[PDB]
Design a protein around this ligand. Sequence first.
Ligand SMILES: [Ca+2]
Ligand SMILES: [Ca+2]
Ligand SMILES: [Ca+2]
Ligand SMILES: [Ca+2]
Ligand SMILES: [Ca+2]
Ligand SMILES: [Ca+2]
Lengths: 208, 208
Amino acid sequence: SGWVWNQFFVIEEYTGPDPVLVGRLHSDIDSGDGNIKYILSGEGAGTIFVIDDKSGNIHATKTLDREERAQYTLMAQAVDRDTNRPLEPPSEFIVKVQDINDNPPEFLHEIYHANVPERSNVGTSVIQVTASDADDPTYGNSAKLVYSILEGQPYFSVEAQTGIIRTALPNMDREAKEEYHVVIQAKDMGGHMGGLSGTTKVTITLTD
Amino acid sequence: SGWVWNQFFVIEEYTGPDPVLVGRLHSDIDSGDGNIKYILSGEGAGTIFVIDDKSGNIHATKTLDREERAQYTLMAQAVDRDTNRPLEPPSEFIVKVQDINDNPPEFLHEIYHANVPERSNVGTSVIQVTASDADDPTYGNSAKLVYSILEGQPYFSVEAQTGIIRTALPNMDREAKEEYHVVIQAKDMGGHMGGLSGTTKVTITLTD
Ligand SMILES: [Ca+2]
Ligand SMILES: [Ca+2]
Ligand SMILES: [Ca+2]
Ligand SMILES: [Ca+2]
Ligand SMILES: [Ca+2]
Ligand SMILES: [Ca+2]
């Protein structure tokens, strides 16, 4: 009451040999004597999700890819094994496939072409670069991307989250170098120990 | 209402890199605007179980061995981030570590010494042999044992579940063979494709 408890979570991409227990239907009249038969209709019910009608345990029959389906709405019933009358009214619940970090961040193009005026002030922006990341930006952080500059410093910087590359050095007269070659990295998981990553190269002209 | 939904399941022995989402506290007033702070007290709360106080997501910080602990009772609170007053009254819930089949059935002794009269009728019992199995006899069937006879047939049989060895051949005059050597197997998972197993040897004398 007040609190909401009717949803179940399932770790995606499970490939162990024994089926994942998603959750259980269960009624408060159930003395667990066995006179009660639970019934499960709805999405994947019977196919992906399968219930033991005494215990009321639902189990996942398949490896699930949360990239394919995040949710399933299912319907619980419970009828009296003898009278066959219902013992609870039928109610919905949702199983939600928990995201796992199984996709590495990927850059929109993996060669950007930028240009910026010769004597620009330190801080002047050059180009926005962004990585899409196929995991769940909603729930996890297998989708929280951090941008680092790998090659191209001390000439240029990149904004930690925005992924914008700005000049980072004063009096950058053009004679100096013909065209600058930078490499930006994008990392999962707010870039922590573990996070999957991907890079790109930006090639910058200093305009006159 | 009627239906009971406040318990969460956690697959044991998880060793993937990303933490298992156990479940989430969540209130029906929560428009998910963020003014609501969830709080988790109880067993392993703070140690094994850890909550994001906006999303209300609980995650498992450790690999769990369901052999060590099957349950944890936890307490949910939810207070208003601004007024700090509570928004739900505090309520208990239990997370239940789901059993995995990680123990193979083991025989009480792995050399039994049995004896049975010479001319016994087919069917006469010789000895009960039982395997303990360290997994959850309650929930799964990683603990449902089946007994087969491996060596010793056609002289003797073994009862599929009881594990009792009985003679299975008429007129078994003793002159014949000095002492009979049988091997019994015990298999997990009602002995299906997969099930872990273990054996023993029974050494039978035919008495005069
Ligand atoms: Ca996936
Ligand atoms: Ca994923
Ligand atoms: Ca990712
Ligand atoms: Ca274990
Ligand atoms: Ca186990
Ligand atoms: Ca076992």
